[PDB]
Amino acid sequence: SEVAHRFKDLGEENFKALVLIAFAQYLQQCPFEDHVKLVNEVTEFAKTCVADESAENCDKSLHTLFGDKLCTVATLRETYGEMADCCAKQEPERNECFLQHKDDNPNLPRLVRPEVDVMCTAFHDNEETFLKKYLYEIARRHPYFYAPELLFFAKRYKAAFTECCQAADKAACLLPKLDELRDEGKASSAKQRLKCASLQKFGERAFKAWAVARLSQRFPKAEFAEVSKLVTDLTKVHTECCHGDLLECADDRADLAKYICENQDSISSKLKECCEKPLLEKSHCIAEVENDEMPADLPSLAADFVESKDVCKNYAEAKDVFLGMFLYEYARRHPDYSVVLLLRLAKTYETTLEKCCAAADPHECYAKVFDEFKPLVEEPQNLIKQNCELFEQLGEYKFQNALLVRYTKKVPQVSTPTLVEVSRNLGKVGSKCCKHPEAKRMPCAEDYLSVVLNQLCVLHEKTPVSDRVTKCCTESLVNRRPCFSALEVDETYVPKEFNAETFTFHADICTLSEKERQIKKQTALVELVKHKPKATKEQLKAVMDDFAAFVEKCCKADDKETCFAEEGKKLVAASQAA
Numbered sequence: 001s002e003v004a005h006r007f008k009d010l011g012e013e014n015f016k017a018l019v020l021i022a023f024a025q026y027l028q029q030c031p032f033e034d035h036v037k038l039v040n041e042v043t044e045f046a047k048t049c050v051a052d053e054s055a056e057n058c059d060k061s062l063h064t065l066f067g068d069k070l071c072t073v074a075t076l077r078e079t080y081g082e083m084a085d086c087c088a089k090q091e092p093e094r095n096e097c098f099l100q101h102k103d104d105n106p107n108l109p110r111l112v113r114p115e116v117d118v119m120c121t122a123f124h125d126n127e128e129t130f131l132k133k134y135l136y137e138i139a140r141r142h143p144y145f146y147a148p149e150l151l152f153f154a155k156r157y158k159a160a161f162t163e164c165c166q167a168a169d170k171a172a173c174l175l176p177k178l179d180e181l182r183d184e185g186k187a188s189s190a191k192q193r194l195k196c197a198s199l200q201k202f203g204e205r206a207f208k209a210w211a212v213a214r215l216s217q218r219f220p221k222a223e224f225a226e227v228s229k230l231v232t233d234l235t236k237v238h239t240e241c242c243h244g245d246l247l248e249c250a251d252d253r254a255d256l257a258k259y260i261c262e263n264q265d266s267i268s269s270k271l272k273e274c275c276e277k278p279l280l281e282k283s284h285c286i287a288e289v290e291n292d293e294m295p296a297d298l299p300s301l302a303a304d305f306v307e308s309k310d311v312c313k314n315y316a317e318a319k320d321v322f323l324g325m326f327l328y329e330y331a332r333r334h335p336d337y338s339v340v341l342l343l344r345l346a347k348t349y350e351t352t353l354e355k356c357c358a359a360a361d362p363h364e365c366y367a368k369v370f371d372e373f374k375p376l377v378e379e380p381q382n383l384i385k386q387n388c389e390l391f392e393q394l395g396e397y398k399f400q401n402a403l404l405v406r407y408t409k410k411v412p413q414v415s416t417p418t419l420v421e422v423s424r425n426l427g428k429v430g431s432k433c434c435k436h437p438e439a440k441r442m443p444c445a446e447d448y449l450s451v452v453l454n455q456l457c458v459l460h461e462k463t464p465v466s467d468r469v470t471k472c473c474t475e476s477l478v479n480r481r482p483c484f485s486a487l488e489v490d491e492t493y494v495p496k497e498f499n500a501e502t503f504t505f506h507a508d509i510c511t512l513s514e515k516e517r518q519i520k521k522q523t524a525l526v527e528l529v530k531h532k533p534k535a536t537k538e539q540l541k542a543v544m545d546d547f548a549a550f551v552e553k554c555c556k557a558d559d560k561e562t563c564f565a566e567e568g569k570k571l572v573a574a575s576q577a578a
């Protein structure tokens, strides 16, 4: 029995949480209640298997069990139409079906939060149910959220209320901590969505390389044979978490933190503090630990990678191991490089050895390889230096607008919402990274952009409308950012034709938070650029200034919300004029 296996390892609490998440991530639409029922029915069953390891079907594979359980409600196509099909499938892939149907942008209602007075009550009254609801609301909106980590956020979420509800001003003590979590969780999910994408779209060889480079930077003192160990395991964890095998993901994940702490001295010296706390906190700590200092006297790469005359031979013997080693070596001594840049170099090298080793005199051929790294390394550096200057002058809002205009001209087919979400995120890179010394900027900035661009890539893949986005996304993982930077403006895009409804501002917007207004302002700027691609950043500006005037105005006018209706068609007349 497997269900028993995992139960003993995780225990009741976690076993129950992980299975809730899994269910929530599979049927994002179904109501809180139903999941709980199934989770319980499933948990009880487990409790019998522990005793009699051959009872009913305790001999099966988690999936069969998990799958049939969901299929007791999925067959209701009136609720989940395209799902009933999944249930009519077999064992080899009734699962794939489900995986293939997760929605990255669920049509789930915004999640507003009641006054602090209610939350505390509800929290205090019933706790487990309070935290279950949390997990359910997150896991269903983030179908790829790194499960094991979600538990960490939960324990954290719990302590927020547990302490704030006993304050002198709950609202003051909670709100903040809750805000700080909302963000961190959105960050964490993105980082993970990229991981799953790599594995799923590009294969594990690609995920491995990413890991080798990243880990080699974090643990410069670690040895190639050690890192590989770590990378091999790590991959498996994530391979599981992303395929939806949450339990084993959580198990293996723990075993890895166990290992890493045991062999502390062999890996990093900043692991101490991490290995002195609760599992959940230990794991989350290791994953976010600062790179170790760089080993003192280190040979030059050129030594064994360009000058040696046995290069091509070694390449032939174990090309995978060889390149792995090159990456590990170049990474460990370059924490100032973004993981994708390292990966870009690594690919440039491989490509070179390929053409070069089949030459009349390899050495002569691959002797100037580092000469090609120069361009690759400066490209991001300049990009960053540039974009941080602009950011520093315009401020975050203005900077986002800039990127809003810029991207919409790039890929005009893309849906306004996505363009808005993505450009907003892209601009957050300014505040996030620009305040860093060049030494930490590039890793900060360019890796952050691979995460953001991956949203656009996944969001897009749902309803593909621009081959340009498709090309850039599917072509090469490591090169996406460069690929998009390359794009200027779509010369084939046929401008849109105004729609009364699209540019009619009402008073309803006068109740929304400040943020939700800039957003309404931005969603406007996008629709403009789509109607006037060849327009300039000059015209656009003056206009944005105008729309600001409209809101500040009507939102302070006493007429029925009619201004917005009559003046709404009035501004439309002015706009078309420009």
Ligand SMILES: CC(=O)C[C@H](c1ccccc1)c1c(O)c2ccccc2oc1=O
Residues within 6 Å of the ligand: 191, 195, 210, 211, 214, 215, 234, 237, 238, 252, 253, 254, 256, 257, 260, 283, 286, 287, 288
């Ligand atoms: C978001 C992260 O940086 C997690 C990190 C990682 C690093 C490279 C590729 C994938 C993930 C990470 C883990 O996911 C992990 C899981 C179990 C035990 C130890 C771990 O350590 C870690 O650094």
